[PDB]
């Protein structure tokens, strides 16, 4: 998963 | 009358749409409905980073960390805020903590965190060069 993204 | 979950999902759509102030407002509505969910704050922090408001993002990261002290993203986004505010030593510590927590949690973000650490250390060194 990419880290700079919304959950 | 949408639920907190619906508001979070709407904010997420607005985020995909690159409508960051609109997304952030939706996460605010989510927080109103249930202010005890760390993810609403870390999501809104990312919006604030995109809006070049690291101080606002930092305060949300702090709110998230009060709710979930183990949050990888709260530490990572906090590190990003500190980088923007030229608090390099704290930024690097937060990114390293995000790295450690992601490992402890057996999460996989590929090379995102080490890449962010490299950027932070470089930025720190460049700030030292800029002063001599």
PDB file of C-alpha atoms in Angstrom:
ATOM      1  CA  UNK A   1       0.000   0.000   0.000  1.00  0.00           C
ATOM      2  CA  UNK A   2       1.170   3.629  -0.633  1.00  0.00           C
ATOM      3  CA  UNK A   3       1.666   5.702   2.501  1.00  0.00           C
ATOM      4  CA  UNK A   4       0.621   9.157   1.388  1.00  0.00           C
ATOM      5  CA  UNK A   5      -2.978   8.345   0.897  1.00  0.00           C
ATOM      6  CA  UNK A   6      -6.180   8.523   2.792  1.00  0.00           C
ATOM      7  CA  UNK A   7      -7.700   5.636   4.762  1.00  0.00           C
TER       8      UNK A   7
ATOM      9  CA  UNK B   1     -28.202  13.399   7.250  1.00  0.00           C
ATOM     10  CA  UNK B   2     -25.114  11.296   6.382  1.00  0.00           C
ATOM     11  CA  UNK B   3     -23.316   9.040   8.895  1.00  0.00           C
ATOM     12  CA  UNK B   4     -19.689   9.579   9.982  1.00  0.00           C
ATOM     13  CA  UNK B   5     -18.702   6.682   7.746  1.00  0.00           C
ATOM     14  CA  UNK B   6     -20.490   8.256   4.753  1.00  0.00           C
ATOM     15  CA  UNK B   7     -18.717  11.556   5.382  1.00  0.00           C
ATOM     16  CA  UNK B   8     -15.367   9.854   5.552  1.00  0.00           C
ATOM     17  CA  UNK B   9     -16.112   8.063   2.288  1.00  0.00           C
ATOM     18  CA  UNK B  10     -17.235  11.349   0.686  1.00  0.00           C
ATOM     19  CA  UNK B  11     -14.050  13.062   1.834  1.00  0.00           C
ATOM     20  CA  UNK B  12     -12.059  10.192   0.326  1.00  0.00           C
ATOM     21  CA  UNK B  13     -13.798  10.731  -3.028  1.00  0.00           C
ATOM     22  CA  UNK B  14     -13.089  14.483  -2.904  1.00  0.00           C
ATOM     23  CA  UNK B  15      -9.470  13.601  -2.148  1.00  0.00           C
ATOM     24  CA  UNK B  16      -9.259  11.407  -5.245  1.00  0.00           C
ATOM     25  CA  UNK B  17     -10.766  14.397  -7.066  1.00  0.00           C
ATOM     26  CA  UNK B  18      -7.987  16.650  -5.782  1.00  0.00           C
ATOM     27  CA  UNK B  19     -10.583  18.825  -4.022  1.00  0.00           C
ATOM     28  CA  UNK B  20      -8.563  19.171  -0.831  1.00  0.00           C
ATOM     29  CA  UNK B  21     -10.340  21.984   1.026  1.00  0.00           C
ATOM     30  CA  UNK B  22     -13.670  20.231   0.286  1.00  0.00           C
ATOM     31  CA  UNK B  23     -12.274  16.874   1.429  1.00  0.00           C
ATOM     32  CA  UNK B  24     -10.892  18.406   4.617  1.00  0.00           C
ATOM     33  CA  UNK B  25     -14.303  19.923   5.398  1.00  0.00           C
ATOM     34  CA  UNK B  26     -15.938  16.510   4.963  1.00  0.00           C
ATOM     35  CA  UNK B  27     -13.477  14.943   7.407  1.00  0.00           C
ATOM     36  CA  UNK B  28     -14.370  17.783   9.770  1.00  0.00           C
ATOM     37  CA  UNK B  29     -18.039  16.730   9.545  1.00  0.00           C
ATOM     38  CA  UNK B  30     -16.971  13.138  10.208  1.00  0.00           C
ATOM     39  CA  UNK B  31     -15.061  14.319  13.280  1.00  0.00           C
ATOM     40  CA  UNK B  32     -18.178  16.166  14.487  1.00  0.00           C
ATOM     41  CA  UNK B  33     -20.173  12.944  14.308  1.00  0.00           C
ATOM     42  CA  UNK B  34     -17.481  10.837  16.007  1.00  0.00           C
ATOM     43  CA  UNK B  35     -14.372  12.701  17.222  1.00  0.00           C
ATOM     44  CA  UNK B  36     -12.742   9.547  18.576  1.00  0.00           C
ATOM     45  CA  UNK B  37     -11.549   8.109  15.247  1.00  0.00           C
ATOM     46  CA  UNK B  38      -7.844   8.721  14.562  1.00  0.00           C
ATOM     47  CA  UNK B  39      -8.156   8.111  10.813  1.00  0.00           C
ATOM     48  CA  UNK B  40     -10.424  11.142  10.306  1.00  0.00           C
ATOM     49  CA  UNK B  41      -7.633  13.328  11.662  1.00  0.00           C
ATOM     50  CA  UNK B  42      -4.798  11.732   9.689  1.00  0.00           C
ATOM     51  CA  UNK B  43      -6.899  11.931   6.531  1.00  0.00           C
ATOM     52  CA  UNK B  44      -7.551  15.638   7.211  1.00  0.00           C
ATOM     53  CA  UNK B  45      -3.866  16.208   7.956  1.00  0.00           C
ATOM     54  CA  UNK B  46      -2.967  14.887   4.489  1.00  0.00           C
ATOM     55  CA  UNK B  47      -5.463  17.351   3.005  1.00  0.00           C
ATOM     56  CA  UNK B  48      -3.890  20.174   4.995  1.00  0.00           C
ATOM     57  CA  UNK B  49      -0.445  19.158   3.728  1.00  0.00           C
ATOM     58  CA  UNK B  50      -1.759  19.346   0.149  1.00  0.00           C
ATOM     59  CA  UNK B  51      -3.166  22.807   0.981  1.00  0.00           C
ATOM     60  CA  UNK B  52       0.256  23.949   2.233  1.00  0.00           C
ATOM     61  CA  UNK B  53      -1.005  24.305   5.794  1.00  0.00           C
ATOM     62  CA  UNK B  54       1.470  22.156   7.763  1.00  0.00           C
ATOM     63  CA  UNK B  55       0.562  23.838  11.085  1.00  0.00           C
ATOM     64  CA  UNK B  56      -3.058  22.763  10.680  1.00  0.00           C
ATOM     65  CA  UNK B  57      -1.885  19.324   9.598  1.00  0.00           C
ATOM     66  CA  UNK B  58       0.419  19.079  12.632  1.00  0.00           C
ATOM     67  CA  UNK B  59      -2.415  19.804  15.064  1.00  0.00           C
ATOM     68  CA  UNK B  60      -4.481  17.008  13.470  1.00  0.00           C
ATOM     69  CA  UNK B  61      -1.550  14.612  13.705  1.00  0.00           C
ATOM     70  CA  UNK B  62      -1.377  15.442  17.422  1.00  0.00           C
ATOM     71  CA  UNK B  63      -5.080  14.735  17.811  1.00  0.00           C
ATOM     72  CA  UNK B  64      -4.663  11.408  16.049  1.00  0.00           C
ATOM     73  CA  UNK B  65      -1.730  10.419  18.261  1.00  0.00           C
ATOM     74  CA  UNK B  66      -3.760  11.092  21.436  1.00  0.00           C
ATOM     75  CA  UNK B  67      -6.315   8.574  20.134  1.00  0.00           C
ATOM     76  CA  UNK B  68      -3.912   6.047  18.595  1.00  0.00           C
ATOM     77  CA  UNK B  69      -0.292   6.258  19.810  1.00  0.00           C
ATOM     78  CA  UNK B  70       0.743   3.516  17.376  1.00  0.00           C
ATOM     79  CA  UNK B  71      -0.520   5.227  14.213  1.00  0.00           C
ATOM     80  CA  UNK B  72       2.077   4.849  11.438  1.00  0.00           C
ATOM     81  CA  UNK B  73       0.436   7.500   9.288  1.00  0.00           C
ATOM     82  CA  UNK B  74       0.130  10.016  12.116  1.00  0.00           C
ATOM     83  CA  UNK B  75       3.887   9.777  12.713  1.00  0.00           C
ATOM     84  CA  UNK B  76       4.659   9.904   8.982  1.00  0.00           C
ATOM     85  CA  UNK B  77       2.445  12.949   8.304  1.00  0.00           C
ATOM     86  CA  UNK B  78       3.781  14.636  11.476  1.00  0.00           C
ATOM     87  CA  UNK B  79       7.295  14.111  10.103  1.00  0.00           C
ATOM     88  CA  UNK B  80       6.192  15.699   6.835  1.00  0.00           C
ATOM     89  CA  UNK B  81       4.784  18.723   8.712  1.00  0.00           C
ATOM     90  CA  UNK B  82       8.011  19.192  10.669  1.00  0.00           C
ATOM     91  CA  UNK B  83      10.019  18.944   7.459  1.00  0.00           C
ATOM     92  CA  UNK B  84       7.972  21.737   5.983  1.00  0.00           C
ATOM     93  CA  UNK B  85       8.439  23.805   9.116  1.00  0.00           C
ATOM     94  CA  UNK B  86      12.212  23.176   9.082  1.00  0.00           C
ATOM     95  CA  UNK B  87      12.217  21.161  12.289  1.00  0.00           C
ATOM     96  CA  UNK B  88      14.545  18.600  10.688  1.00  0.00           C
ATOM     97  CA  UNK B  89      15.708  16.599  13.725  1.00  0.00           C
ATOM     98  CA  UNK B  90      12.120  16.044  14.892  1.00  0.00           C
ATOM     99  CA  UNK B  91      11.023  15.240  11.320  1.00  0.00           C
ATOM    100  CA  UNK B  92      13.648  12.534  10.935  1.00  0.00           C
ATOM    101  CA  UNK B  93      12.729  11.072  14.342  1.00  0.00           C
ATOM    102  CA  UNK B  94       9.068  10.901  13.389  1.00  0.00           C
ATOM    103  CA  UNK B  95       9.810   9.291  10.023  1.00  0.00           C
ATOM    104  CA  UNK B  96      12.123   6.745  11.668  1.00  0.00           C
ATOM    105  CA  UNK B  97       9.345   6.055  14.184  1.00  0.00           C
ATOM    106  CA  UNK B  98       6.876   5.543  11.320  1.00  0.00           C
ATOM    107  CA  UNK B  99       9.401   3.080   9.822  1.00  0.00           C
ATOM    108  CA  UNK B 100       9.761   1.178  13.120  1.00  0.00           C
ATOM    109  CA  UNK B 101       6.011   1.057  13.729  1.00  0.00           C
ATOM    110  CA  UNK B 102       5.253  -0.106  10.171  1.00  0.00           C
ATOM    111  CA  UNK B 103       7.777  -2.926  10.742  1.00  0.00           C
ATOM    112  CA  UNK B 104       6.399  -3.834  14.177  1.00  0.00           C
ATOM    113  CA  UNK B 105       2.907  -3.881  12.645  1.00  0.00           C
ATOM    114  CA  UNK B 106       4.129  -5.885   9.740  1.00  0.00           C
ATOM    115  CA  UNK B 107       2.785  -3.326   7.281  1.00  0.00           C
ATOM    116  CA  UNK B 108       4.213  -2.884   3.853  1.00  0.00           C
ATOM    117  CA  UNK B 109       4.482   0.529   2.198  1.00  0.00           C
ATOM    118  CA  UNK B 110       7.215  -0.487  -0.172  1.00  0.00           C
ATOM    119  CA  UNK B 111      10.021   2.087  -0.211  1.00  0.00           C
ATOM    120  CA  UNK B 112       7.817   5.051   0.719  1.00  0.00           C
ATOM    121  CA  UNK B 113       9.138   5.558   4.238  1.00  0.00           C
ATOM    122  CA  UNK B 114      12.859   5.031   3.516  1.00  0.00           C
ATOM    123  CA  UNK B 115      12.450   7.396   0.537  1.00  0.00           C
ATOM    124  CA  UNK B 116      10.876  10.019   2.813  1.00  0.00           C
ATOM    125  CA  UNK B 117      13.714   9.559   5.341  1.00  0.00           C
ATOM    126  CA  UNK B 118      16.284  10.111   2.598  1.00  0.00           C
ATOM    127  CA  UNK B 119      14.521  13.264   1.497  1.00  0.00           C
ATOM    128  CA  UNK B 120      14.435  14.493   5.131  1.00  0.00           C
ATOM    129  CA  UNK B 121      18.118  13.808   5.798  1.00  0.00           C
ATOM    130  CA  UNK B 122      19.103  15.501   2.541  1.00  0.00           C
ATOM    131  CA  UNK B 123      16.970  18.467   3.331  1.00  0.00           C
ATOM    132  CA  UNK B 124      18.608  18.638   6.750  1.00  0.00           C
ATOM    133  CA  UNK B 125      22.101  18.515   5.282  1.00  0.00           C
ATOM    134  CA  UNK B 126      21.214  21.093   2.631  1.00  0.00           C
ATOM    135  CA  UNK B 127      20.027  23.424   5.420  1.00  0.00           C
ATOM    136  CA  UNK B 128      23.439  23.126   7.049  1.00  0.00           C
ATOM    137  CA  UNK B 129      25.178  23.927   3.731  1.00  0.00           C
ATOM    138  CA  UNK B 130      22.846  26.888   3.215  1.00  0.00           C
ATOM    139  CA  UNK B 131      24.238  28.400   6.419  1.00  0.00           C
ATOM    140  CA  UNK B 132      27.982  28.261   5.746  1.00  0.00           C
TER     141      UNK B 132
END
